[PDB]
Amino acid sequence: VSKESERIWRLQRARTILEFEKMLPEWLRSRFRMGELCKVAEDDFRLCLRINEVKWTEWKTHVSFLNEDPG
Amino acid sequence: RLKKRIFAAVSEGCVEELVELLVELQELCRRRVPDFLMHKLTASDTGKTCLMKALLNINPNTKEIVRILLAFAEENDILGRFINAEYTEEAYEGQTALNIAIERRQGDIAALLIAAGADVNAHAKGAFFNPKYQHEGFYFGETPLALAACTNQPEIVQLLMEHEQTDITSRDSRGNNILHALVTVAEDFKTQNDFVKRMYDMILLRSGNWELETTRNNDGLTPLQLAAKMGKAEILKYILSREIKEKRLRSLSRKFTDWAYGPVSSSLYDLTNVDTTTDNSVLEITVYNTNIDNRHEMLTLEPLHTLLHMKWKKFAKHMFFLSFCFYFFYNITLTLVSYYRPRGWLQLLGRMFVLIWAMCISVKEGIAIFLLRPSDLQSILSDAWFHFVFFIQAVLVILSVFLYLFAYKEYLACLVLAMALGWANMLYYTRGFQSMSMYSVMIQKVILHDVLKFLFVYIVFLLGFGVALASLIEKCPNKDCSSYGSFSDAVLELFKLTIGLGDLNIQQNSKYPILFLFLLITYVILTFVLLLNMLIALMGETVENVSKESERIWRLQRARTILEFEKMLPEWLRSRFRMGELCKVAEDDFRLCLRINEVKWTEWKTHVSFLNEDPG
Ligand SMILES: COc1ncnc(OC)c1C(=O)Nc1nc(C(F)(F)F)c(-c2ccnc(C(C)(C)C#N)c2)s1
Ligand SMILES: COc1ncnc(OC)c1C(=O)Nc1nc(C(F)(F)F)c(-c2ccnc(C(C)(C)C#N)c2)s1
């Protein structure tokens, strides 16, 4: 029942987030506008969302990346 | 341009012959002294060279590419200033090609660079490698040895440690050496699978000497005190009980099993920077730091656990019982002067007792509050909170005596409040005994968490339905025509409807009686649902969680009480108690060891080692 209450809270939270995003005008929505514009290919330039993670298990040489200088 | 051409030729890696041709052309242009060559081989803005740019972009043909690059550098007497070129940007300042070859987990190329003269003592002192927040930057110790250790590369660590020019005892920007950095980097077992403990053991044995463990960073913290400060419980458990059975590296041990026969084992733990006789030991740090929430797991490690147990048995049990007895008799006298109030032979003697003891309690708990750092008050079921209620009660007592000496009538409110709060504060002492600990923590959890939330929502219900049923009731010319008359009348009737002292059938006197009874039955149903909700939350959630949470809170309060009592004693008394006896460990070691005999009846192994084989 606590799973159920937490799940209901998360679902209604997402629902009211989307409700509130619909009330704003166009300019306020464009001023919030989640997502940074990023070039991912030769000429792609698609809006992305950045997520940092730390994994201490899958040790691999890093050969796929867009920037060679992290930060 | 040739710089961009060579850079792309060395980064793409699909063409090594193209960089060979460009290097032939570079030698041709150089035929026309070293500075022009390295200005055409390193990006002037950042400082990245063809070695860095080649190692950042790894491909199956990068070993031959770096061989070609180092050959061209050696054939020009420039290898020195080329293989040890570093960044210049304030983000990766000091990063070298060895750092880049180790972060890419390139063992062959790393051995190549070290055998070609790369300074293994380079310090990546840039804002990326010394960040302020994780996930933006990565702190490893600012050294290729620390980088190879922090990223689980035991073979590169062996290669760097078997080097002669390497420096294991080198301190980075923060003063952290390899061991402070390994402590800073350790996370958990469900996150790292416990390789930092293995790297710690390896780097400590290979450099067999106390210079790494006795080094203080820019905060004065050794690796052990640093593992205590940030709650690295696995690293701390490893260090605090670390037994080297090798005959030469046994002085690096902290626990010396010298006795084991069957399931029994009498070991000798080390108490050098542990047993509360130094500036800030592992015991005091482990007990007093409230920025981790891992103390429950760290106060169970063998030396700290037995040290707290023995401090208790020796003096703190008695000091706690005397504290409890004094507070109990102070509360009894406060009760007696509250009941027998004036409405001076021995009464004033007792009042002066409670007044001087209230002043003493007030100064004590006020001192404790002054040096009471935040993050202690993070949890409500924490001992730090009690200093506040003890202070408030002592303040109420002295304020009531002040108001009684003068001609005020409100001294009785303060006196009765002080008596009630003292009897409540006895809960601090019942949380110090063991059984009463579980009982009192369960009671206080119920109250402070669930009773207060339920009481907030229930006060909302009470006030709402009291206004609703009071506005529905017609004024009438002044004996009790109604029962839900004034607002306080309605709130009282609803409250004692909840606790079972109320009747649904009263003098109506209202003009909308069906709406009145609908609202009343709605109150009853909603408050039953709320009551049963709280009751279900209690009966389900706390049958398993607070069961152990009781032991957690008891252990924390016990440790904090033991340590403050030990601080209260005079220095000669502390010197008298001072658990732990001297023991010769090596040629000249002579450390204060604590003997702990542990019988584990689930033993399947054999023991052959000793310090005094003759069982004590
Ligand atoms: C709305 O329901 C609730 N919602 C949340 N919490 C609740 O309890 C606090 C309740 C509830 O009804 N509680 C109870 N009240 C009483 C009363 F004695 F007062 F009658 C209970 C009772 C009655 C008779 N014999 C016992 C013994 C001593 C055997 C036990 N045990 C207990 S039980
Ligand atoms: C007297 O017994 C009854 N007879 C007939 N109907 C009843 O229910 C309406 C009842 C009954 O239990 N009433 C109650 N009133 C209250 C009050 F909060 F208001 F004080 C209850 C209470 C008080 C304090 N902590 C709880 C916890 C959080 C432990 C729970 N759960 C519940 S319980």
TrEMBL record, chain A:
Protein name: Transient receptor potential cation channel subfamily V member 3
Stated role: Non-selective calcium permeant cation channel. It is activated by innocuous (warm) temperatures and shows an increased response at noxious temperatures greater than 39 degrees Celsius. Activation exhibits an outward rectification. The channel pore can dilate to provide permeability to larger cations. May associate with TRPV1 and may modulate its activity. Is a negative regulator of hair growth and cycling: TRPV3-coupled signaling suppresses keratinocyte proliferation in hair follicles and induces apoptosis and premature hair follicle regression (catagen).
Section of the entire sequence shown: 684 to 754 of 791
Organism: Homo sapiens (Human)
Family, similarity comment: Belongs to the transient receptor (TC 1.A.4) family. TrpV subfamily. TRPV3 sub-subfamily.
Subcellular location: Cell membrane; Cytoplasm; Lysosome
Origin: domain of life: Eukaryota
Subunit description: Homotetramer. May convert from a homotetramer to a homopentamer to allow pore dilation. Interacts with TRPV1; may form a heteromeric channel with TRPV1. Interacts with SNX11; this interaction promotes TRPV3 trafficking from the cell membrane to lysosome for degradation.
